[PDB]
Ligand binder design. Structure first.
Ligand SMILES: *[C@@H]1O[C@H](CO)[C@@H](O[C@@H]2O[C@H](CO)[C@@H](O)[C@H](O)[C@H]2NC(C)=O)[C@H](O)[C@H]1NC(C)=O
Ligand code: CUO
Ligand code: CUO
Lengths: 106, 131, 106
């Protein structure tokens, strides 16, 4: 499983900058494998490459996966549920406060 | 499609504009093999441009005798083996008499008329399709 | 304590007892032998679980994974020592950068 780091373009262009690869991991399995699903999400630290791109880790981007079988056979992206970006704020951190009292009707 | 694909199609280009290009490069592929395998010349052709009376000797004769070492051997160009089917599986041939047509009074051999017809074309794609 | 050393740090004599031992283990058709022990993990699958078809015996993807391979390593270790094997099966630290597979198997 190859981890590509994508930056959106606001257009019809389909030009999503997924050029840069963020990570990589591997999965063992086989036929007559015991069916299984992790009770918790596997997390792969991609912070370094995100900082390298010169964009904030908090800011928007996404992560996509190129899944090659051990066969060498490239597989559909649908084989694995889509990756997400998990962001962990610097503790302790308060996100922005609520805007003030009603003026005047809610 | 790629060597790893689940579903594959035939490799070579046919019935499309780049057909000559693909097969040009495909011949130099075969050419470089036998030049490095000790052929002093490039890949020979037999031109259908001239009317045919017969299939060329190095193509048709089943056995070949080396004049220099005097040993009779099987002619490598007579046929080819298809490895994956079985060791005992060879290409085979059947010759149509349509190959050996000769010019008549006003008439001219199929290939001649149709080769010119292709060579007449001024547009590459119009050339390619006829060709 | 049966000691499991680093593969890199083995003495030729250690290597020799390991060699003759695992050869001897390789010549056992008995349940102490190499094949019989290897068949505990993977093909052929003697195990059956959940839905009733034949399934691989080893445990992967579940929290029970590390304990299972822990016990499997004991079983293999003892399967060794039943032929000396004065030492326990070595680990190779691949957290260390590599150039080639460890020399023992090269
Ligand atoms: C190698 O890739 C897969 C096996 O990982 C093979 O294709 C199929 O894999 C899916 C699951 O991802 C199964 O549902 C299909 O039944 C498999 N089909 C077959 C025919 O095995 C694929 O066949 C392999 N590539 C090659 C060499 O064909
Ligand atoms: O066939 Cu592939 O070209 Cu003569
Ligand atoms: O083998 Cu089942 O664990 Cu790596």
């Amino acid at each position: 499983v190859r981890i590509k780091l994508c930056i959106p373009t606001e257009d019809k262009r389909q030009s999503d900058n997924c050029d840069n690869d963020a990570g990589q991991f591997f999965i063992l399995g086989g036929t007559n494998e015991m069916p299984w699903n992790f009770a918790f999400p596997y997390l792969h630290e991609i912070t370094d490459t995100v900082l390298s791109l010169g964009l904030a880790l908090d800011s928007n981007y996404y992560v996509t996966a190129e899944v090659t079988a051990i066969n060498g056979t490239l597989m559909p992206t649908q084989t694995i549920p889509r990756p997400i970006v998990t962001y962990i704020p610097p503790q302790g951190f308060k996100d922005v406060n609520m805007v003030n009292m009603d003026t005047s009707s809610l | 499609p790629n060597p790893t694909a689940k579903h594959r199609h035939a490799c070579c280009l046919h019935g499309m504009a780049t057909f000559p290009q693909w097969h040009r490069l495909y011949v130099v592929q075969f050419e470089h093999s036998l030049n490095r395998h000790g052929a002093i010349v490039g890949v020979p052709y037999w031109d259908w441009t001239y009317p045919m009376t017969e299939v060329p000797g190095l193509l048709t004769s089943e056995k070949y005798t080396d004049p220099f070492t005097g040993i009779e051997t099987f002619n490598p160009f007579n046929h080819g083996h298809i490895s994956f089917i079985s060791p005992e599986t060879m290409t085979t041939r059947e010759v149509s008499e349509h190959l050996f047509e000769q010019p008549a009074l006003g008439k001219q051999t199929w290939l001649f008329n149709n080769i010119i017809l292709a060579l007449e074309q001024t547009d590459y794609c119009d050339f390619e399709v006829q060709f | 304590n049966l000691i499991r050393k680093n593969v890199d740090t083995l003495t030729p004599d250690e290597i020799l007892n390991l060699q003759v031992s695992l050869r001897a283990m390789q010549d056992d058709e008995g349940a102490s032998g190499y094949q019989a022990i290897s068949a505990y993990h993977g093909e052929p699958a003697d195990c059956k679980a959940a839905d009733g078809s034949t399934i691989v015996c080893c445990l992967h993807g579940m929290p029970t994974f590390p304990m299972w391979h822990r016990l499997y390593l004991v079983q293999f270790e003892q399967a060794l020592v039943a032929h000396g094997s004065t030492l326990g099966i070595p680990y190779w630290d691949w957290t260390k950068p590599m150039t080639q597979l460890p020399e023992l198997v090269q």
